[PDB]
Amino acid sequence: EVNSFSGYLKLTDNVYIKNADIVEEAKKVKPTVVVNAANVYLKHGGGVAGALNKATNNAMQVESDDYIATNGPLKVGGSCVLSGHNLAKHCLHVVGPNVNKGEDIQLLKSAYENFNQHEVLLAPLLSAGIFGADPIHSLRVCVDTVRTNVYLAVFDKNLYDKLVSSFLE
Numbered sequence: 689e690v691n692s693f694s695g696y697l698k699l700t701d702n703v704y705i706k707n708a709d710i711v712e713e714a715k716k717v718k719p720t721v722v723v724n725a726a727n728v729y730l731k732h733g734g735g736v737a738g739a740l741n742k743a744t745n746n747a748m749q750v751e752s753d754d755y756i757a758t759n760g761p762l763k764v765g766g767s768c769v770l771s772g773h774n775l776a777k778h779c780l781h782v783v784g785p786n787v788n789k790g791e792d793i794q795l796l797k798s799a800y801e802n803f804n805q806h807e808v809l810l811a812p813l814l815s816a817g818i819f820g821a822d823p824i825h826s827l828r829v830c831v832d833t834v835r836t837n838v839y840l841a842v843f844d845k846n847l848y849d850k851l852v853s854s855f856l857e
């Protein structure tokens with residue numbers, strides 16, 4: 689079955705959240721789209737990007753290198769649609785701002801706007817973790833920006849509980 693999301697808690701009409709590893713969810717669910725928390729050169733060296741790349745056994749990286757060769761880098765707030773390989777039908781590579789490297793938090797709304805071109809997505813919390821944005825603020829931006837159906841996988845129970853407590857739904 690496609691998009692077989694299970695165990696999510698519905699926060700709003702179109703945003704759901706689960707304490708889970710996004711790669712494990714991609715393998716179980718088989719979604720139409722998995723979102724990658726990418727950088728502008730599509731180099732998947734660690735974190736969510738490294739984990740998704742490793743589960744495709746480097747097929748994501750080879751295809752990403754070919755995208756960059758022909759099209760050039762993305763911009764912060766921008767995206768591209770590539771194959772999802774064995775994890776999903778497509779991978780939506782989205783570049784949120786890295787506030788730990790000085791990029792502007794205003795581009796986080798632009799980053800989430802890319803999700804609106806896909807009816808259903810499995811995604812991570814953009815710009816959270818090593819990108820340095822306040823994860824609770826990133827969830828508020830997601831809720832206010834995304835209008836399609838988004839299932840967020842957040843792999844830290846401590847953070848998940850703080851997000852659910854802040855949201856109160």
Ligand SMILES: CC(=O)N1[C@@H]2CC[C@H]1c1c(ncnc1N[C@H](c1ccc3c(c1)S(=O)(=O)CCC3)C(C)C)C2
Pocket residue numbers: 708709710711725734735736737739812813814815816817818819823841842843844847
């Ligand atoms: C095994 C493991 O701990 N994980 C893998 C890959 C990373 C971690 C993980 C997995 N699935 C979902 N959220 C995860 N981490 C969250 C998260 C959310 C967004 C971002 C990152 C991290 S990042 O990679 O640090 C920078 C890009 C944006 C974290 C906040 C708990 C699966």
